[PDB]
Write an enzyme that holds these catalytic residues in place. Structure first.
Site, PDB file in Angstrom:
ATOM      1  N   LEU A  22      40.935  39.787  58.238  1.00 43.12           N
ATOM      2  CA  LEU A  22      42.016  40.623  58.746  1.00 43.12           C
ATOM      3  C   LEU A  22      41.745  41.160  60.146  1.00 43.12           C
ATOM      4  O   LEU A  22      42.687  41.317  60.933  1.00 43.12           O
ATOM      5  CB  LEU A  22      42.257  41.791  57.786  1.00 43.12           C
ATOM      6  CG  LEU A  22      42.592  41.408  56.341  1.00 43.12           C
ATOM      7  CD1 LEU A  22      42.635  42.649  55.457  1.00 43.12           C
ATOM      8  CD2 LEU A  22      43.911  40.649  56.275  1.00 43.12           C
ATOM      9  N   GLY A  23      40.487  41.438  60.475  1.00 44.25           N
ATOM     10  CA  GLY A  23      40.132  41.930  61.790  1.00 44.25           C
ATOM     11  C   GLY A  23      38.645  41.819  62.052  1.00 44.25           C
ATOM     12  O   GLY A  23      37.835  42.083  61.161  1.00 44.25           O
ATOM     13  N   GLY A  25      35.940  43.126  64.957  1.00 39.56           N
ATOM     14  CA  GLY A  25      35.511  43.811  66.150  1.00 39.56           C
ATOM     15  C   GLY A  25      34.087  43.471  66.524  1.00 39.56           C
ATOM     16  O   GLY A  25      33.496  42.499  66.025  1.00 39.56           O
ATOM     17  N   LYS A  26      33.514  44.284  67.411  1.00 39.82           N
ATOM     18  CA  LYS A  26      32.163  44.018  67.887  1.00 39.82           C
ATOM     19  C   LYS A  26      31.127  44.375  66.829  1.00 39.82           C
ATOM     20  O   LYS A  26      30.139  43.652  66.650  1.00 39.82           O
ATOM     21  CB  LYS A  26      31.901  44.795  69.176  1.00 39.82           C
ATOM     22  CG  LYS A  26      31.294  43.963  70.301  1.00 39.82           C
ATOM     23  CD  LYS A  26      32.334  43.100  71.023  1.00 39.82           C
ATOM     24  CE  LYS A  26      33.352  43.949  71.782  1.00 39.82           C
ATOM     25  NZ  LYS A  26      34.364  43.127  72.509  1.00 39.82           N
ATOM     26  N   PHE A  27      31.336  45.483  66.119  1.00 40.39           N
ATOM     27  CA  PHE A  27      30.401  45.947  65.101  1.00 40.39           C
ATOM     28  C   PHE A  27      31.056  46.137  63.741  1.00 40.39           C
ATOM     29  O   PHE A  27      30.461  46.772  62.861  1.00 40.39           O
ATOM     30  CB  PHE A  27      29.744  47.255  65.548  1.00 40.39           C
ATOM     31  CG  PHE A  27      28.955  47.123  66.809  1.00 40.39           C
ATOM     32  CD1 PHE A  27      27.770  46.408  66.820  1.00 40.39           C
ATOM     33  CD2 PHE A  27      29.399  47.700  67.985  1.00 40.39           C
ATOM     34  CE1 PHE A  27      27.038  46.271  67.983  1.00 40.39           C
ATOM     35  CE2 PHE A  27      28.673  47.569  69.152  1.00 40.39           C
ATOM     36  CZ  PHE A  27      27.490  46.853  69.152  1.00 40.39           C
ATOM     37  N   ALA A  28      32.262  45.604  63.543  1.00 43.38           N
ATOM     38  CA  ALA A  28      32.953  45.732  62.268  1.00 43.38           C
ATOM     39  C   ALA A  28      33.752  44.466  62.003  1.00 43.38           C
ATOM     40  O   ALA A  28      34.244  43.816  62.930  1.00 43.38           O
ATOM     41  CB  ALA A  28      33.888  46.945  62.243  1.00 43.38           C
ATOM     42  N   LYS A  45      35.984  46.752  54.919  1.00 39.53           N
ATOM     43  CA  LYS A  45      35.548  46.951  56.297  1.00 39.53           C
ATOM     44  C   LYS A  45      34.025  47.003  56.304  1.00 39.53           C
ATOM     45  O   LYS A  45      33.424  47.915  55.726  1.00 39.53           O
ATOM     46  CB  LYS A  45      36.157  48.226  56.876  1.00 39.53           C
ATOM     47  CG  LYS A  45      36.006  48.378  58.385  1.00 39.53           C
ATOM     48  CD  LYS A  45      36.782  49.590  58.887  1.00 39.53           C
ATOM     49  CE  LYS A  45      36.661  49.757  60.393  1.00 39.53           C
ATOM     50  NZ  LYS A  45      37.294  51.020  60.872  1.00 39.53           N
ATOM     51  N   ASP A 141      43.027  57.316  68.962  1.00 37.38           N
ATOM     52  CA  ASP A 141      43.064  55.864  69.072  1.00 37.38           C
ATOM     53  C   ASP A 141      44.305  55.324  68.375  1.00 37.38           C
ATOM     54  O   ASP A 141      44.232  54.339  67.632  1.00 37.38           O
ATOM     55  CB  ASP A 141      41.796  55.256  68.475  1.00 37.38           C
ATOM     56  CG  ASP A 141      41.481  53.890  69.047  1.00 37.38           C
ATOM     57  OD1 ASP A 141      41.913  53.599  70.182  1.00 37.38           O
ATOM     58  OD2 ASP A 141      40.799  53.103  68.357  1.00 37.38           O
TER      59      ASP A 141
HETATM   60  N1  ATP Z   1      43.061  48.117  55.277  1.00 37.39           N
HETATM   61  C1  ATP Z   1      43.491  47.173  56.124  1.00 37.39           C
HETATM   62  N2  ATP Z   1      44.446  46.346  55.735  1.00 37.39           N
HETATM   63  C2  ATP Z   1      44.873  45.395  56.602  1.00 37.39           C
HETATM   64  N3  ATP Z   1      44.406  45.223  57.824  1.00 37.39           N
HETATM   65  C3  ATP Z   1      43.432  46.051  58.250  1.00 37.39           C
HETATM   66  C4  ATP Z   1      42.957  47.047  57.395  1.00 37.39           C
HETATM   67  N4  ATP Z   1      42.007  47.716  58.058  1.00 37.39           N
HETATM   68  C5  ATP Z   1      41.884  47.168  59.282  1.00 37.39           C
HETATM   69  N5  ATP Z   1      42.747  46.155  59.405  1.00 37.39           N
HETATM   70  C6  ATP Z   1      42.894  45.351  60.559  1.00 37.39           C
HETATM   71  O1  ATP Z   1      41.612  45.123  61.099  1.00 37.39           O
HETATM   72  C7  ATP Z   1      41.620  45.471  62.505  1.00 37.39           C
HETATM   73  C8  ATP Z   1      40.328  46.178  62.844  1.00 37.39           C
HETATM   74  O2  ATP Z   1      40.060  47.176  61.820  1.00 37.39           O
HETATM   75  P1  ATP Z   1      39.863  48.689  62.263  1.00 37.39           P
HETATM   76  O3  ATP Z   1      40.943  49.089  63.252  1.00 37.39           O
HETATM   77  O4  ATP Z   1      39.940  49.603  61.037  1.00 37.39           O
HETATM   78  O5  ATP Z   1      38.369  48.847  62.973  1.00 37.39           O
HETATM   79  P2  ATP Z   1      37.768  48.403  64.458  1.00 37.39           P
HETATM   80  O6  ATP Z   1      38.767  48.790  65.538  1.00 37.39           O
HETATM   81  O7  ATP Z   1      37.532  46.923  64.498  1.00 37.39           O
HETATM   82  O8  ATP Z   1      36.370  49.214  64.715  1.00 37.39           O
HETATM   83  P3  ATP Z   1      36.025  50.829  64.770  1.00 37.39           P
HETATM   84  O9  ATP Z   1      36.595  51.496  63.536  1.00 37.39           O
HETATM   85  O10 ATP Z   1      34.508  51.086  64.849  1.00 37.39           O
HETATM   86  O11 ATP Z   1      36.713  51.353  66.014  1.00 37.39           O
HETATM   87  C9  ATP Z   1      42.804  46.403  62.715  1.00 37.39           C
HETATM   88  O12 ATP Z   1      43.428  46.130  63.971  1.00 37.39           O
HETATM   89  C10 ATP Z   1      43.762  46.088  61.574  1.00 37.39           C
HETATM   90  O13 ATP Z   1      44.803  45.205  62.018  1.00 37.39           O
HETATM   91 MG    MG Z   2      41.206  49.210  65.685  1.00 34.13          MG
END
Ligand code: ATP
Ligand code: MG
Length: 280
Positions: A22-23, A25-28, A45, A141
């Site tokens: 679904l997503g 990132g750099k550390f997630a 996550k 954010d």
């Molecule tokens: N519960 C969820 N259900 C569906 N999609 C999700 C969910 N959580 C996150 N995502 C998707 O994953 C992407 C990244 O997740 P999230 O925004 O929670 O963390 P991050 O930006 O990658 O890192 P950090 O929290 O350290 O800033 C989001 O843009 C979102 O589209």
């Molecule tokens: Mg995000």
């Protein structure tokens, strides 16, 4: 180093990961998972504890607390379970099937979302933000990527996610904030003013602007002009862009996209704006 949350053996026992990502990132990383017990779909996550050579378990614990704090709020994503292994902390979150509202801000889906829909979504984003501010919590954010939908056919309800930037009112403007996508930063973050609850009200104006016009209100030829547009509040309210947007909507956006944070209304006031008073 010892582990605090449930064992990884348990996660593999009760859940099964899928190929659906679904997503990242750099550390997630957010992967979809299914409960073996019930079959329900969840979002997992994965948060690396070591970042840039620093231990960040404390930061992750903060994000969990805030998620825990707003568990009674339906406008905020629900934390189901927490697991941990050697390098990661795993958050079993509620699954948002509709995805990001960023999808609706693109011209491809412009003709399927009406102003009566934007009014409802924005009224839900305010209810969620109102709760966070009632508890001295600023999101910091609220870009469209961090606001999800429970459904998209038909349009569902919003679900706020991503609390890695959450602070408490009065906190200093640390380096983390002034690093996000330039086009979503508020003007008070650029000259290093202390963050306030009004910082979120700015991003809510951008989201409403982006839903109605399907355009970024401040992005420019390069990051440098984007900063100048933000610090000068150089938004486009031209007739060509707003010919199909009501006047009440323009008044709503122009009340929020103000340079002086002290003048932006609070979430409580915004929930009373005439534009949100449609009898559905
Ligand atoms: N519960 C969820 N259900 C569906 N999609 C999700 C969910 N959580 C996150 N995502 C998707 O994953 C992407 C990244 O997740 P999230 O925004 O929670 O963390 P991050 O930006 O990658 O890192 P950090 O929290 O350290 O800033 C989001 O843009 C979102 O589209
Ligand atoms: Mg995000």
């Amino acid at each position: 180093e010892n582990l605090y949350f449930q064992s990884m053996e348990n996660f593999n026992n009760f859940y099964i990961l899928t190929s659906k990502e679904l997503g990242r990132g750099k550390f997630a990383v957010v992967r979809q998972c299914i409960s073996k017990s019930t079959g329900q779909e969840y979002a997992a996550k994965f948060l690396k504890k070591r970042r840039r050579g620093q231990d960040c378990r404390a930061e992750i614990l903060h994000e969990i607390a805030v998620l825990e704090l707003a568990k009674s709020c339906p406008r905020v994503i629900n934390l189901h379970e927490v697991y941990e292994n050697t390098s990661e902390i795993i958050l079993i979150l509620e699954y948002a099937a509709g995805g990001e509202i960023f999808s609706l801000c693109l011209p491809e889906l412009a003709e399927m979302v009406s102003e009566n829909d934007v009014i409802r979504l924005i009224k839900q984003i305010l209810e969620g933000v109102y709760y966070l501010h009632q508890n001295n919590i600023v999101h910091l954010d609220l870009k469209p990527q961090n606001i999800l939908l429970s459904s998209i056919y038909p349009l569902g309800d919003i679900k706020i996610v991503d609390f890695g930037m959450s602070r408490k009112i009065g906190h200093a403007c640390e380096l983390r904030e002034i690093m996000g996508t330039p086009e979503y930063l508020a003007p008070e973050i650029l000259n290093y003013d202390p963050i306030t609850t009004a910082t979120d009200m700015w991003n809510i104006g951008i989201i409403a602007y982006m839903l109605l016009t399907h355009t970024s209100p401040f992005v420019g030829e390069d990051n440098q002009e984007t900063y100048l547009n933000i610090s000068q509040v150089n938004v486009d309210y031209s007739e060509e862009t707003f010919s199909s947007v009501s006047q009440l909507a323009t008044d709503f956006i122009q009340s929020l996209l103000v340079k002086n944070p002290e003048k932006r209304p609070t979430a409580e006031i915004c929930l009373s704006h005439s534009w949100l008073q449609q009898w559905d």
